Amino acid sequence: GRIDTCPAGGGXXEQXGTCC
Predict the structure, then answer these.
(1) Which residues have CB under 8 Å from 12's CB, separation 6+?
(2) Cα-trace Rg, the chain
(3) Over 1-20, what HEC string results?
(4) Is 19 left (phi over 0), alpha (psi -120 to 50) or beta?
(5) CA dihedral over 10, 1, 15, 13, signed as positive or negative
(6) What is the Cα–Cα distance from 19 to 6, expressed in whole angstroms?
(7) How far apart are CA 8 and CA 19, in angstroms?
(8) Distance from chain centroid for Cα 13
(9) Do residues 18 and 7 lie in contact, with contact meaning Cβ atoms separated by under 8 Å?
(10) CB of 6 within 8 A of CB of 12?
(11) Contact at 8 Å (CB) between 19 and 13?
């Protein structure tokens, strides 16, 4: 889930996974 699309990225917003 989390970090899945936003690895090492706490702010997985539009950057990827997270919420992107």
Answers:
(1) 2, 3, 5, 6, 18, 19, 20
(2) 6
(3) CCCCCCCCCCCCCCCCCCCC
(4) alpha
(5) negative
(6) 9
(7) 14
(8) 6
(9) no
(10) yes
(11) yes
Q: How was this structure determined?
A: NMR
Two structure tokens written together for 19: 């919420």
Cα–Cα distance measured from residue 1 to residue 8, given in angstroms and rounded to the nearest whole number: 13
Asked whether the beta carbons of 3 and 10 are under 8 A apart, the reply is no
